[PDB]
Symmetry: D2
Subunit: 116 residues, 4 copies
């Protein structure tokens, strides 16, 4: 897929499984419109969010529901969610892997961008 998200748990040393996330795309009127959503698999990965045809140029936001994840494990975390906002496909189609590493009071996010 042109967009994949991978989430890891830094407390348990495991993929972060069943983590919900919503993707939005910024509309011409500057509002965030729903684009795609899903949950991470047993591998901590979410594939198949979109297609090369649908994933046009624009500004996208991935909101990862990290708070529900920690809560279900008995932990009250700091962040409401982890947010990743980026311009996609500005110079033609790319594949994007967004990786998030989660701790209760901290998170890291990185992007790997490759040319098809």
């Amino acid at each position: 897929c042109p967009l994949m998200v991978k989430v890891l748990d830094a407390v348990r040393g495991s993929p972060a499984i069943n983590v919900a996330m919503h993707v939005f795309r910024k509309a011409a009127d500057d509002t965030w419109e729903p684009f795609a959503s899903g949950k991470t698999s047993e591998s901590g990965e979410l594939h198949g969010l979109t297609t090369e045809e649908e994933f046009v140029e624009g500004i996208y936001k991935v909101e990862i529901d990290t708070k529900s994840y920690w809560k279900a494990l008995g932990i009250s975390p700091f962040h409401e969610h982890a947010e990743v906002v980026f311009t996609a496909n500005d110079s033609g189609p790319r594949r994007y892997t967004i990786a998030a590493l989660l701790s209760p009071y901290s998170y890291s996010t990185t992007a790997v961008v490759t040319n098809p």
Copy 2:
């Protein structure tokens, strides 16, 4: 201050200076109301954003303009900005630290008494 933000540059090994950010508070209609902003000092820190009386429980967002920072250094960045969204809950001081790279950022909260 009950809220301080510190920003570091992982490419140059330095404070991230003159980084602009806005702080928003979530309203009843679920929109973001601006309520504080500033830019980081030479030590990469932004102090004096709010007071104890003003900083009531609620959901807050700190939006750090990382894109402009990297653009001024001539480096193309991935993120439009870095956002930190959190609930403040009731003596507490919040220090939000953000470590910046062109294609990655990390943020941590140090919450003390």
Copy 3:
């Protein structure tokens, strides 16, 4: 494999390719003995370092040569290398994925540990 290492470049948003690393295992006399070595592929991954039979209980150190990596890209980085030291297989065989995220003055490392 029971041991895999993945290295990413946070400046370029890409896998870190051709990154050398050496693995050592602590000997009975407390010295580090060479165990395995290799370089990351185009995917930023290094597979096939060892086998389940060879990868016995012990304390292992992965030394990732991050300095040579940055130097070849024209950057003088802070760290000599990134080091990952851990006890492996203490409770029976596990699979270990060590992920390192590199910037010139910072690095992060995480482990994903799974039960075969």
Copy 4:
């Protein structure tokens, strides 16, 4: 001090207090010679490790006993310790920050004038 270390806890959102560490300098025979050590304060910081005259160019290693820290909190950790190995090169102050999780750590250097 020309060298300061700061350690933070990503699970509890706090300074990592009473974390022991040793600093070594690389010798001509390629062995590590101990030369400073201490444990972090209530602010998670360790100051006074060395002086400008003593802190000459060379390769240094800071070995942070993260395992003992997590063990005292009843949490099983992955790493034996966190090591930061770097060359000091010639006015410079080094601040080494380490952010700790049970299965992950990050370290950054802030090098200033």
